[PDB]
């Protein structure tokens, strides 16, 4: 019966840590890789704010990502 709030707060900020440095940074990579050459000025500012806020999380899984252009069908 570990329904104690002393454990539930540990659970909630242990989930918050993962959301901050494991989950939302990947969504930021995805979103900011999708809308980069088409974003407006304010959207660019918001994207850079998003990188600023989650930088500690973006650093951790940065080495595990390739943004290379995915070789194309040449004959076509």
């Amino acid at each position: 019966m570990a329904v104690s709030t002393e454990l539930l707060v540990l659970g909630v900020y242990g989930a918050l840590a993962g959301l901050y440095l494991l989950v939302v940074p990947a969504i930021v990579y995805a979103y900011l890789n999708a809308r980069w050459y088409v974003a407006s000025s304010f959207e660019r500012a918001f994207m850079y704010f998003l990188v600023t806020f989650f930088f500690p999380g973006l650093l951790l899984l940065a080495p595990f990502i390739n943004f290379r252009p995915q070789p194309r069908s040449l004959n076509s």
């Binding site: 974003a39 000025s41 660019r44 290379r68 194309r72």
Partner: protein, 193 residues
Amino acid sequence: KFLNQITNYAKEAVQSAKYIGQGLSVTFDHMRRRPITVQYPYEKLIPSERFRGRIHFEFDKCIACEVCVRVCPINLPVVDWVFNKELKKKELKHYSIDFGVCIFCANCVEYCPTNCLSVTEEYELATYDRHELNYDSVAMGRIPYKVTQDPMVTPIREFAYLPAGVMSGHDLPAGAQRAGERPEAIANTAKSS
């Protein structure tokens, strides 16, 4: 005497503030436009139709008249002929060009009488050892690069091969032509009325 100086000071300060606000707005606007960067390693810029790249040499067409050696600004192309004695025919033994000394002016390609010498679109020459830039008669043909036939490069036309009114060549359809009609098309239209 003293009020004119102050009104000039105010008319200068407010002007300097407006002319900074305008530049700030212009710069904050600039970051909405698509970057013109031609991201070279994966977005190589396809060269023109007259681009003077590495020289190409067809050993079979050379007659060893040495005009390439004579119109060269620095007499660069080494031609080693022996003049066989069948009736009069010169024989070619070794043709070479030190591309480390080369100037890429293509005077040699302009005055080759036998179309034995040509220019290519290989601008990607680079070595760790300059002594490897001296091209044999065989290392010169080698069937040039053709940036377009590369599975990891999205070719990008330059300003002279983009349709009318188009300035950048990044977001381009798959059916663009250079600027206008070719001469054969204009003559064909003139042929029918």
